[PDB]
Amino acid sequence: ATGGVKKPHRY
């Protein structure tokens, strides 16, 4: 799981 760069619709 990623959470720091782009934050689109869900991924």
Next chain:
Amino acid sequence: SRLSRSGASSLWDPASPAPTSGPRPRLWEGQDVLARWTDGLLYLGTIKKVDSAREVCLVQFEDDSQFLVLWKDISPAAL
């Protein structure tokens, strides 16, 4: 030589007043867009440039990625 491209989309005009239910945002500088990539995953970015002549736009992404996207692969990030 062929004259037709095969497959006609919308060729009829309205005879009575019809309201708009499904609005479509436009490409402008500072527009949060969703640039679909060939990996199957979406990309979030804001519009840095606009090409209304070739139906293209340049957008700056979250990870400082400046990637050229087409108006067909773009999805306005609002809802």
